[PDB]
Structure 1
Amino acid sequence: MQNNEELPTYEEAKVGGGGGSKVTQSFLPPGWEMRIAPNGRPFFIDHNTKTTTWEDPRLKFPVHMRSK
């Protein structure tokens, strides 16, 4: 496939110097960030929980800002 869906480290996500194959603007919820992965796809970034994912929780809930 033209994507690997390899979720890179968060340290990579701060820059996200990936590649572009399936890249576009996905349905990121507020509070999150969306960066480009080297495998050619954008992933979601959550700064509150310091996590990343390919699946947007936006579909079920919008910005759920983890306070602490």
Structure 2
Amino acid sequence: KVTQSFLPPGWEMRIAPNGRPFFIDHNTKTTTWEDPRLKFPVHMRSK
């Protein structure tokens, strides 16, 4: 699919035992998988 693996500053790409790669941002302490829509601004437009 159109979901490419990239390594952005602060993020760390690892693999979860469930078989999905996850990105953990060491800046904001966040950890999630790269969702398609997550890559685009959703919360900062949905008001």
TM bin, normalised by shorter chain, reads: 0.5 to 0.7
Larger strand share, 1 or 2: 2
> Does the 8 Å contact 2:15/2:22 carry over to 1?
yes
Q: Give TM-score scaled by structure 2 length.
A: 0.54
Q: Taking CA–CA contacts closer than 8 Å with sequence separation of 6 or more, which of the two structures ends up with the larger relative contact order? A: 1
Give every structure 1 segment of 4 or more consecutive aligned residues whose post-TM-superposition deviation is greater than 4 Å: 22-25, 56-68
Give the TM-score of the pair, scaled to structure 1. Answer: 0.41
User: What's the C-alpha RMSD, in Å, of the aligned pairs?
Assistant: 6.7
Q: 1:28 to 1:65 in 2, by over 3 A?
A: farther
Q: Which of 36-45 and 47-56 deviates more?
A: 47-56
Determine if contact 2:15/2:21 at 8 Å carries over to the other structure.
yes
Unaligned runs of 5+ in 2: none
1:37 deviates by: 0.1
Q: Size of the alignment, in residue pairs?
A: 47
| Per-residue CA distance 1:18-67 (angstroms, 9 max, x = gap) | xxxx9998223122101110111111010111111112799969999999
Do residues 45 (structure 1) and 17 (structure 2) align? no
Tell me the distance in 1 between the aligned counterparts of 2:30 and 2:43: 13
Instruction: Give the percent of matched residue pairs that are identical in Structure 1 and Structure 2.
Output: 100
Unaligned 5+ runs, structure 1: 1-21
